[PDB]
Structure 1
Amino acid sequence: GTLGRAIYTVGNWIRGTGQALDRVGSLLQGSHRIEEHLSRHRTLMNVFDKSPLVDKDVFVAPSASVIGDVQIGKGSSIWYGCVLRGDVNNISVGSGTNIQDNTLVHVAKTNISGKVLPTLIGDNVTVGHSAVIHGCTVEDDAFVGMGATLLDGVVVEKHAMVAAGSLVKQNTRIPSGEVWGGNPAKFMRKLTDEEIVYISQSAKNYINLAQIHASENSKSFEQIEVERALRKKYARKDEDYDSMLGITRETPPELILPDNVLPGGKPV
């Protein structure tokens, strides 16, 4: 009513005074600080004339920049800080894959060696923690080492785990079941059955791991207020007072992680 209008007016006066005082304070600094702008980053954007073909079931991190003509399959996800810089040739990404944090996948400009082929990514394959992909042609059911630098012409087949930190050189093809690693190609060991099962289990598990990140990074601000209020409200419990009041404080359904991301299943 009238009191509400008066309080709105005095709030507007206070806001204007605060803006003027903030401007004066910034002026006193000598304009040596760069003021913050809203957002110049786009999570995925066209390069010349074509937009990426991202599937509906894909988790793309807002930090990640999947630019240009990049095709992403079902269930596959892009993690934080990962750059899919595809500007000259398509980047076909399989289904259920995961290009992990700080990872780069880039395509040569069709003439790095003369017969350049586009960077093709298989399905059910993992890249792993900021690896380097430049013209690679990874197929299904493979593991790439952490920080690996698979260069142009590298054709890694199925069950072709690459040791972390490897530097596979130009036009190198690894047979299935090898653990080639080190700064050179430098074959180390053979992929055992249990290690293959471990690779498959990791590839399958990160698929259901990405769903919580998808449902969290996409939350609206109004949902975030409720989420923070609930999280702070139920941070700690007290059996004494709750029992005395005859009530039990259960965690809200919005505060329940799915059982598939637990350390192995702890419903209780």
Structure 2
Amino acid sequence: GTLGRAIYTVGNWIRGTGQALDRVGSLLQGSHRIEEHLSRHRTLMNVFDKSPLVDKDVFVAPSASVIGDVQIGKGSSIWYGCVLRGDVNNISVGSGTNIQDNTLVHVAKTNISGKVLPTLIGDNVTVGHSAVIHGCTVEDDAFVGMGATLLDGVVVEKHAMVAAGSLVKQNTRIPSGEVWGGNPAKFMRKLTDEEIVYISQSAKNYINLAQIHASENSKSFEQIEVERALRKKYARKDEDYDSMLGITRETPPELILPDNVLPGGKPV
């Protein structure tokens, strides 16, 4: 009531004094420091009357930048720091195919070679971290290792792999079942069936892993504070005192990950 109003007015006075002190301290610094501003980074952006068509189930990290004509299929994911610039031409991302951290997918200027085609990425493909794609036509069920660079005009056929730290030269086709790699990107070896199983399992594991990141990066301020308080409360345990009190403190469901992302599916 009256006490609450008085305390509110005192708080207003204190806030005004604090802001004045902040301004004075900024003045003494010589106005050299560049003040932090509101985040102007747009996760999804338009360029020329063209909007991305990100599907409902896709996980697009807030630090990612999906720009221009980008079409992304269900179950796929775009991870932190990734850039998909489809301003000049089209970029189509298939279903279940994840583009990993700091990766760049860009499309040529439709005249880099005269007969340029849009960047097409098939289904259930996985692209490693820091990879660079500049006009490829990666077919479905393919693997691109982390750090690999795919120049314009290349096609990665189904069930083919590009070794990490490779450079596939322009107009180079990787046949099915090969592990083309190296800086010239020459033939290394044939793919074994275990490698194919590993590729499919990695794609499915990333589809499974994108969900917790999506559920964590979309929380509100109120939910974040509650989860932080719960995490602090259950960080350390004391079974002896609980046994003395006859209680059993159990971790809330907000701090429990699904068993399908644990190393071996641990129920307990």
TM-score, length of structure 2 as denominator length:
0.99
- Whole-Å separation in 1 of the counterparts to 2:12 and 2:131: 52
Q: 2:76: which partner in 1?
A: 76
- Whole-Å separation in 2 of the counterparts to 1:12 and 1:86: 49
Deviation at 1:90, TM superposition (A): 1.2
For residue 86 of structure 1, give the secondary structure of its aligned residue in structure 2.
Answer: strand
- Whole-Å separation in 1 of the counterparts to 2:140 and 2:216: 29
- Whole-Å separation in 2 of the counterparts to 1:185 and 1:10: 70
- Whole-Å separation in 2 of the counterparts to 1:238 and 1:39: 42
- Whole-Å separation in 2 of the counterparts to 1:174 and 1:95: 22
Deviation at 1:27, TM superposition (A): 0.4
Q: 1:96: which partner in 2?
A: 96
- Whole-Å separation in 2 of the counterparts to 1:182 and 1:33: 46
For residue 45 of structure 2, give the secondary structure of its aligned residue in structure 1.
Answer: coil
Q: List gaps (5 residues or longer) in structure 2.
A: none
Deviation at 1:265, TM superposition (A): 1.0
Q: Residues 43-89 of structure 1: CA distance to partner in whole angstroms, max 9, x if unpaired? A: 01111111101100110011000000000000000000000011111
- Fraction of identical pairs, as percent: 100
- Whole-Å separation in 2 of the counterparts to 1:241 and 1:174: 63
Please give the root-mean-square deviation of Cα atoms over the aligned residues, in Å.
0.5
- Whole-Å separation in 2 of the counterparts to 1:136 and 1:36: 39
Q: 2:172: which partner in 1?
A: 172
- Whole-Å separation in 1 of the counterparts to 2:146 and 2:47: 28
- Whole-Å separation in 2 of the counterparts to 1:232 and 1:104: 37
- Whole-Å separation in 1 of the counterparts to 2:224 and 2:43: 21
Q: 1:150: which partner in 2?
A: 150
Q: Residues 91-126 of structure 1: CA distance to partner in whole angstroms, max 9, x if unpaired? A: 111001100000000000000010000000101000
Q: 1:108: which partner in 2?
A: 108
Q: How many residues align?
A: 268
Q: List gaps (5 residues or longer) in structure 1.
A: none
- Whole-Å separation in 2 of the counterparts to 1:8 and 1:211: 43
- Whole-Å separation in 2 of the counterparts to 1:91 and 1:14: 53
Deviation at 1:185, TM superposition (A): 2.2
TM-score, length of structure 1 as denominator length:
0.99
**Structure 1: 4+ residue segments shifted above 3 A:** none
